[PDB]
Design a protein around this ligand. Structure first.
Ligand SMILES: O=c1[nH]c(=O)n([C@H]2C[C@H](O)[C@@H](CO)O2)cc1/C=C/Br
Ligand SMILES: O=c1[nH]c(=O)n([C@H]2C[C@H](O)[C@@H](CO)O2)cc1/C=C/Br
Lengths: 188, 182
């Protein structure tokens, strides 16, 4: 009944805080490009939505641009989640769920998304799960302490408190509404 | 492949400008509630999104609220478009297409939606047509002159008129029954 039902291989979602070595960890899979569908966080797309840089505007002016940005992330995820592929295995960096449970949720808390904006996304999330098929077999959680995450970023800029909030949300979601097995890794 | 594919009866879309007697014209179908799936513009829903009145905010503060409002309209329309029904015929007041081609498009022009917000909705619109099945067999266009729609800003209604015109008289293919709603 749902879109992209039955059309998807075994799917692994790589999840974690910002600066938890997600990009590094994925490069290790990069040499099986030919047997793995390797889909990395489409930040490229969020930085150019037909010219417009949504990611910039989001940070620059959050109360205004959070809503469209998040909506756009949710889309790009779905495109990833639903892309067709001949490959026997699919690996995504993050997913619709982390967008919904970590980022949208946090932005609600620190009032980046007002009640109206948040509720629109949530009605959309609720609709999407009714309509579109999101194949998820294993999440690999690259666990870290905020402290550590913060550094990787100081190495390569968002506040430590922010990363802490994202950490708590990732923790709530993955350690303590998503059932399918969660492989916890130590990314310290 | 698409969601709600194969699950929809013959579908008629009543389209027209604001104040072109759409609501009136639908009430005439209201007495076949039992054989017709009669789905009216869900303005109720846009006025209360779990407490919040999006329609208000949109008018009150356009540059800020246009984006979520439209996004929400788009959803409510999809919910209508895709709702299940045993009935042999389905009739909707407006649709996803008039949201996209008339309202979003206008708001782009008068810069209610900036380039980044517009584009997000469009990408979404593009995605939606790939993924969700929108059954549309006949559009009934209740044509009018802005003037009249008015007597029931005028420039706004004029722009909405031009867009409705471009879309329905001069990309959506499936037969268009033009009525005169003057
Ligand atoms: O919802 C989000 N909000 C958000 O701000 N980001 C930012 C964080 C980082 O700056 C950059 C790369 O992950 O994108 C990601 C997501 C979702 C990924 Br799913
Ligand atoms: O997309 C829309 N945007 C919009 O602003 N409206 C407004 C016009 C009027 O004030 C009121 C009655 O429909 O709602 C309708 C739609 C319907 C789209 Br389908």
């Amino acid at each position: 009944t749902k879109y992209a039902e039955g059309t998807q291989p075994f799917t692994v979602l790589i999840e974690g805080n910002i600066g938890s070595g997600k990009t590094t960890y994925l490069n290790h899979f990069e040499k099986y490009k030919n047997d793995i569908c390797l889909l990395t966080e489409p930040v490229e797309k969020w930085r150019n939505v037909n010219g417009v840089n949504l990611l910039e505007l989001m940070y620059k002016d959050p109360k205004k641009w959070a809503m469209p940005f998040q909506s756009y992330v949710t889309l790009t995820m779905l495109q990833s989640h639903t892309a067709p592929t001949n490959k026997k295995l699919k690996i995504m960096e993050r997913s619709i769920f982390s967008a919904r449970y970590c980022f949208v949720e946090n932005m609600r808390r620190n009032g980046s998304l007002e009640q109206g904006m948040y509720n629109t996304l949530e009605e959309w999330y609720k609709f999407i799960e009714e309509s579109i098929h999101v194949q998820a077999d294993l999440i690999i959680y690259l666990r870290t302490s905020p402290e550590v995450a913060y550094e990787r970023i100081r190495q390569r800029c968002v506040p430590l408190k922010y990363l802490q909030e994202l950490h708590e949300l990732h923790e709530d979601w993955l350690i303590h509404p998503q059932s399918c097995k969660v492989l916890v890794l130590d990314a310290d």
